Design an enzyme around this catalytic site. Structure first.
Site, PDB file in Angstrom:
ATOM      1  N   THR A   1     -11.825  -0.818  -4.957  1.00 13.49           N
ATOM      2  CA  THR A   1     -12.293  -2.201  -5.078  1.00 13.49           C
ATOM      3  C   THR A   1     -13.310  -2.527  -3.995  1.00 13.49           C
ATOM      4  OG1 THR A   1     -10.257  -2.900  -6.155  1.00 13.49           O
ATOM      5  CG2 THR A   1     -11.505  -4.620  -5.010  1.00 13.49           C
TER       6      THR A   1
ATOM      7  N   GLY B   1      -5.191   2.139  -9.024  1.00  6.36           N
ATOM      8  CA  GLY B   1      -4.972   3.526  -8.643  1.00  6.36           C
ATOM      9  C   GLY B   1      -3.572   4.051  -8.857  1.00  6.36           C
TER      10      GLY B   1
ATOM     11  N   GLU C   1       0.102   5.348  -8.364  1.00  5.80           N
ATOM     12  CA  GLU C   1       1.143   4.780  -7.510  1.00  5.80           C
ATOM     13  C   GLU C   1       2.540   5.266  -7.885  1.00  5.80           C
ATOM     14  OE1 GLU C   1       0.349   0.539  -8.013  1.00  5.80           O
ATOM     15  OE2 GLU C   1       1.381   0.521  -9.961  1.00  5.80           O
TER      16      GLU C   1
ATOM     17  N   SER D   1      -3.540   4.247  -5.081  1.00  3.83           N
ATOM     18  CA  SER D   1      -3.470   2.860  -4.616  1.00  3.83           C
ATOM     19  C   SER D   1      -3.812   2.719  -3.123  1.00  3.83           C
ATOM     20  CB  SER D   1      -2.084   2.284  -4.887  1.00  3.83           C
ATOM     21  OG  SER D   1      -2.026   0.913  -4.527  1.00  3.83           O
ATOM     22  N   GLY D   2      -4.740   1.818  -2.808  1.00  6.77           N
ATOM     23  CA  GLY D   2      -5.177   1.571  -1.441  1.00  6.77           C
ATOM     24  C   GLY D   2      -6.274   2.486  -0.925  1.00  6.77           C
TER      25      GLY D   2
ATOM     26  N   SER E   1      -3.827  -5.211  -3.637  1.00  8.98           N
ATOM     27  CA  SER E   1      -3.746  -4.265  -4.741  1.00  8.98           C
ATOM     28  C   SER E   1      -4.252  -4.913  -6.012  1.00  8.98           C
ATOM     29  CB  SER E   1      -2.298  -3.831  -4.957  1.00  8.98           C
ATOM     30  OG  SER E   1      -2.202  -2.711  -5.820  1.00  8.98           O
ATOM     31  N   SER E   2      -5.153  -4.238  -6.737  1.00 13.26           N
ATOM     32  CA  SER E   2      -5.657  -4.752  -8.004  1.00 13.26           C
ATOM     33  C   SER E   2      -4.566  -4.525  -9.038  1.00 13.26           C
ATOM     34  CB  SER E   2      -6.913  -3.999  -8.432  1.00 13.26           C
ATOM     35  OG  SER E   2      -7.847  -3.880  -7.373  1.00 13.26           O
TER      36      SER E   2
ATOM     37  N   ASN F   1      -0.661  -1.327  -1.050  1.00 10.81           N
ATOM     38  CA  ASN F   1      -1.902  -2.031  -0.717  1.00 10.81           C
ATOM     39  C   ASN F   1      -1.699  -3.554  -0.670  1.00 10.81           C
ATOM     40  OD1 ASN F   1      -4.647  -3.005  -0.685  1.00 10.81           O
ATOM     41  ND2 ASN F   1      -5.280  -1.850  -2.476  1.00 10.81           N
TER      42      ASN F   1
HETATM   43  N1  LIG Z   1     -14.844   0.809   3.179  1.00 11.09           N
HETATM   44  C1  LIG Z   1     -13.865   0.067   3.712  1.00 11.09           C
HETATM   45  N2  LIG Z   1     -14.119  -0.614   4.850  1.00 11.09           N
HETATM   46  C2  LIG Z   1     -13.147  -1.361   5.382  1.00 11.09           C
HETATM   47  N3  LIG Z   1     -11.898  -1.548   4.945  1.00 11.09           N
HETATM   48  C3  LIG Z   1     -11.675  -0.861   3.820  1.00 11.09           C
HETATM   49  C4  LIG Z   1     -12.579  -0.051   3.151  1.00 11.09           C
HETATM   50  N4  LIG Z   1     -11.996   0.504   2.021  1.00 11.09           N
HETATM   51  C5  LIG Z   1     -10.776   0.027   2.035  1.00 11.09           C
HETATM   52  N5  LIG Z   1     -10.511  -0.803   3.094  1.00 11.09           N
HETATM   53  C6  LIG Z   1      -9.251  -1.483   3.400  1.00 11.09           C
HETATM   54  O1  LIG Z   1      -8.211  -0.903   2.627  1.00 11.09           O
HETATM   55  C7  LIG Z   1      -7.695  -1.864   1.676  1.00 11.09           C
HETATM   56  C8  LIG Z   1      -7.448  -1.169   0.360  1.00 11.09           C
HETATM   57  O2  LIG Z   1      -8.705  -0.870  -0.283  1.00 11.09           O
HETATM   58  P1  LIG Z   1      -8.982  -1.342  -1.783  1.00 11.09           P
HETATM   59  O3  LIG Z   1     -10.420  -1.128  -2.062  1.00 11.09           O
HETATM   60  O4  LIG Z   1      -8.390  -2.681  -2.017  1.00 11.09           O
HETATM   61  O5  LIG Z   1      -8.116  -0.266  -2.585  1.00 11.09           O
HETATM   62  P2  LIG Z   1      -7.943   0.217  -4.108  1.00 11.09           P
HETATM   63  O6  LIG Z   1      -8.346   1.677  -4.089  1.00 11.09           O
HETATM   64  O7  LIG Z   1      -6.495   0.005  -4.483  1.00 11.09           O
HETATM   65  O8  LIG Z   1      -8.893  -0.643  -4.916  1.00 11.09           O
HETATM   66  C9  LIG Z   1      -8.734  -2.983   1.648  1.00 11.09           C
HETATM   67  O9  LIG Z   1      -8.174  -4.236   1.268  1.00 11.09           O
HETATM   68  C10 LIG Z   1      -9.244  -2.985   3.088  1.00 11.09           C
HETATM   69  O10 LIG Z   1      -8.375  -3.709   3.955  1.00 11.09           O
HETATM   70  O1  VO4 Z   2      -4.316  -0.576  -4.885  1.00 13.02           O
HETATM   71  V1  VO4 Z   2      -5.185  -0.523  -6.183  1.00 13.02           V
HETATM   72  O2  VO4 Z   2      -5.780   0.910  -6.406  1.00 13.02           O
HETATM   73  O3  VO4 Z   2      -4.260  -0.848  -7.405  1.00 13.02           O
HETATM   74  O4  VO4 Z   2      -6.332  -1.589  -6.125  1.00 13.02           O
HETATM   75 MG   LIG Z   3      -8.337  -2.275  -6.151  1.00 11.73          MG
END
Ligand SMILES: Nc1ncnc2c1ncn2[C@@H]1O[C@H](COP(=O)(O)OP(=O)(O)O)[C@@H](O)[C@H]1O
Ligand code: VO4
Ligand SMILES: [Mg+2]
Ligand SMILES: COc1cc(N2CC[C@@]3(O)C(=O)c4cc(C)c(C)cc4N=C23)ccn1
Ligand SMILES: [Cl-]
Length: 713
Positions: free
Chosen positions: A144, A411, A413, A139-140, A188-189, A185
């Site tokens: 996404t 992800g 968690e 997670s995070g 978080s999705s 996160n």
């Molecule tokens: N490549 C990136 N560039 C900038 N910020 C990022 C990047 N990847 C992640 N983040 C930051 O970290 C947060 C968590 O990433 P996200 O893709 O939402 O996670 P997850 O793996 O849960 O889908 C994002 O909302 C953003 O604030």
């Molecule tokens: O934080 V997530 O991996 O559930 O998007």
């Molecule tokens: Mg996500």
């Protein structure tokens, strides 16, 4: 070369240092097995770690670290790629950078998510094989964020633009209704998805379809400390203008029981301004102002359901509703009668053979009933929104020849309390990790034997079959999910009895840990690939069955509001007065069948720290992720094996410019033409193997041939 080797460290994970006295060595800046060879400075911030002369944990860690603090988050690791979350918006996703990576090969440009998307897109057209980009990580980690950049890149590169406009607004709409702030996160999705991008025979985008999996609908009624419910609840309360506010019957953040912690902010975005972005996004997708109002009335009715208060009366078990204000607001928004809803929720008619009879409801039974209606109402709204997003995106009449899918699951968690939602989320990551292990180590080595090349099987030790059998196996012995289904179809079954049967049937399993006598059969642990997780099985029988008050669903089915009646049209698969675990396995099986019929491209997202900070890389957290992900083993199979494969016709056609006077004129067998070309090129025999239908090459060998092809102009 000043005898510099990596020495284990406690602050930075590993530290470099410069006599061999027996089974020990002396460093200055330790056991003989503890030391690891350091690569020379020529591999400083190397693009592909398969090029490193000394492959070990310390060299991979150092190369990711030196790149991370230089604003370089992407790093190739053989066939797959690794990406560390920066937690800072870097200027690496502009339209100029989309143009730079357009049509470029992996070796021609630095590592990037655009190069991964382009490589898969060209393989789709060249090999005529459906492609899939699979983002893994806890997670995070950034799954996404990388998924959305693949869409952003493909929308520009594979186009002649209403479809591109709508495709870019698909994730913003789904994130407003499906994402939430958790302790791990802020966005978080709380739903998994597989975005299928369809292309015509030429290669332009024609349509798209988003397949979502189980929604964490239980988040709409209760949230843990510091966490928020789905974003849209805050966007609506903060951003609704004066007139819309009265139409939706809204109050403040402290006036809703389903908002456990009231208003909780997100540092990166304002909820009132995010409401306008969501309204603009819904307008681009084709949702009219009347349909957006209907959507927000259902979101408001979910909140109003939580304000219904039941009182346990004295001298009787039947519950009472002294204040029907919340119930009146619910029925006004949902388009149902108040008197019917009240008598249906307090005294419903249950089938007791062939006829029905009025049965009493206690405060606990009435509260549970209202909570489960709110979860079902929200799930149906999210299902309706997705059905209309897909109707707009897959609207084309053009013939789709191929597709490129992107998988973006929730992800791994570990919260303070982990319920049935967390088990299925963490198990999906276990299956996705085993798909990586199967693709990189089993299918790769089976392909070598299939083509008759001299190869000895190397066992990399990465296999999660015990955990897969522990949870998913239906019979001989029944897994966790099968045992949960079996317990639900028992009359006097409790959550305590489920954990007791789990301990007798799977107690001696190497990936199951029985609870200590302190917890009265309430919890149980599972040793996942990433780590041990304690699961509290409270309300698991009710969460697996998902019962609904058929009397209230009948009223919502015949609602005066057409939008509410459209959400409650399908009321046949409602158990009340297939289980969720059974639906989970059918959704998981469908995804795995789809992915087996595609060429996967793994993007391993690594989280640098658990504090959501930029410029901080916790070495042991990164090291643990590289171990459970199998990054080092995955690079090892690239170096020890032959990662690049090419058929005899494509090798002869693409590289004949490098050996022009090697093949004589006229017809020639593809296999023999390639042998004649390799003799002329003077390649070392260890760098390649001739198979039955294709030539196998070591890492970087085929990249050097492509670079030499550019010289010929
Ligand atoms: N490549 C990136 N560039 C900038 N910020 C990022 C990047 N990847 C992640 N983040 C930051 O970290 C947060 C968590 O990433 P996200 O893709 O939402 O996670 P997850 O793996 O849960 O889908 C994002 O909302 C953003 O604030
Ligand atoms: O934080 V997530 O991996 O559930 O998007
Ligand atoms: Mg996500
Ligand atoms: C009881 O199980 C749950 C699971 C929930 N979730 C939330 C994220 C989720 O959709 C996700 O990533 C996922 C992905 C795939 C491929 C599957 C099959 C299920 C999934 N289950 C998911 C939610 C509520 N109850
Ligand atoms: Cl890959």
């Amino acid at each position: 070369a000043k005898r510099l080797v990596w020495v284990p460290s406690e602050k930075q994970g590993f530290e470099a240092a410069s006599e061999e006295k027996g089974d020990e060595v002396v460093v200055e800046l330790v056991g003989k097995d503890d030391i690891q060879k350091m690569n020379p400075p020529k591999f400083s911030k190397v693009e592909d770690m398969a090029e490193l002369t000394c492959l070990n944990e310390a060299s991979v860690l150092h190369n990711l670290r030196e790149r991370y603090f230089s604003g370089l988050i992407y790093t190739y690791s053989g066939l797959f790629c690794v990406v560390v979350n920066p937690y800072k918006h870097l200027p690496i996703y502009s339209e100029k950078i989309v143009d730079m990576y357009k049509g470029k090969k992996r070796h021609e440009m630095p590592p990037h998510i655009y190069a991964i998307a382009d490589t898969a897109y060209r393989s789709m057209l060249q090999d005529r094989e459906d492609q899939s980009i699979l983002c893994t990580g806890e997670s995070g980690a950034g799954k996404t964020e990388n998924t959305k950049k693949v869409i952003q890149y493909l929308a520009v590169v594979a186009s002649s633009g209403e479809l591109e406009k709508q495709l870019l607004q698909a994730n913003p709409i789904l994130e407003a209704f499906g994402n939430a702030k958790t302790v791990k996160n802020d966005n978080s999705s709380r739903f998994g998805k597989f975005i299928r991008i369809n292309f015509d025979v030429t290669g332009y985008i024609v349509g798209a379809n988003i397949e979502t999996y189980l929604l964490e609908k239980s988040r709409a009624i209760r949230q843990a400390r510091d966490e928020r419910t789905f974003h849209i609840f805050y966007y609506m309360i903060a951003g609704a203008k004066e007139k819309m506010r009265s139409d939706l019957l809204l109050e403040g953040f402290n006036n809703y029981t389903f908002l456990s912690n009231g208003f909780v902010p997100i540092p990166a975005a304002q909820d009132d301004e995010m409401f306008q972005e969501t309204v603009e996004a819904m307008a681009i997708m084709g949702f009219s102002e009347e349909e957006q109002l209907s959507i927000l009335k259902v979101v408001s009715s979910v909140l109003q359901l939580g304000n219904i208060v039941f009182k346990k009366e004295r001298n009787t078990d039947q519950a009472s509703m002294p204040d029907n204000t919340a119930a009146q607001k619910v029925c006004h928004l949902m388009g149902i009668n108040v008197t019917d809803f009240t008598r249906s929720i307090l005294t419903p008619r249950i089938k007791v053979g062939r006829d029905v009879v009025q049965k009493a409801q206690t405060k606990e039974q009435a509260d549970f009933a209202v909570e489960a209606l709110a979860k079902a109402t929200y799930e149906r709204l999210f299902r309706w929104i997705l059905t209309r997003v897909n109707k707009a995106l897959d609207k084309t009449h053009r013939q789709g020849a191929s597709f490129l899918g992107i998988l973006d699951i929730a992800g791994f968690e570990i919260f303070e309390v982990n319920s049935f939602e967390q088990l299925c989320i963490n198990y999906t990551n276990e299956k996705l990790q085993q798909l990586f292990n199967h693709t990189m180590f089993i299918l790769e080595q089976e392909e070598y034997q299939r083509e008759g090349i001299e190869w000895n099987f190397i066992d990399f030790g990465l296999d999660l079959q015990p955990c897969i059998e522990l949870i998913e196996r239906p019979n001989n012995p029944p897994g966790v999910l099968a045992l949960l289904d079996e317990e639900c179809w028992f009359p006097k079954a409790t959550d305590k009895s489920f954990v007791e049967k789990l301990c007798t049937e799977q107690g001696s399993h190497p990936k199951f840990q029985k609870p200590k006598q302190l917890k009265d059969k309430t919890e149980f642990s599972i040793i996942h690939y990433a780590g041990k997780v304690d699961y509290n099985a409270s309300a698991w029988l009710t969460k697996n069955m998902d019962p609904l008050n058929d009397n209230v669903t009948s009223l919502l089915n015949a609602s005066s509001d057409k939008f509410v009646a459209d959400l409650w049209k399908d009321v046949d698969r409602i158990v009340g007065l297939r289980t969720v675990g059974q639906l989970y396995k059918e959704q998981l099986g469908k995804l795995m069948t789809t992915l087996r019929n595609t060429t996967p491209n793994f993007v391993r997202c690594i989280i640098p720290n658990h504090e959501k900070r930029s410029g901080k890389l916790d070495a042991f957290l990164v090291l643990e992720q590289l171990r459970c992900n199998g990054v080092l083993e995955g690079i090892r199979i690239c170096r020890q094996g032959f990662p690049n494969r090419i058929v005899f016709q494509e090798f002869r056609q693409r590289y004949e410019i490098l050996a022009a006077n090697a093949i004589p004129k006229g017809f020639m067998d593809g296999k023999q033409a390639c042998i004649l070309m390799i003799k002329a090129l003077e390649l070392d025999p260890n760098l390649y193997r001739i198979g039955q239908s294709k030539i196998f090459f070591r890492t970087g060998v085929l990249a050097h041939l492509e670079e030499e092809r550019d010289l010929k102009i």
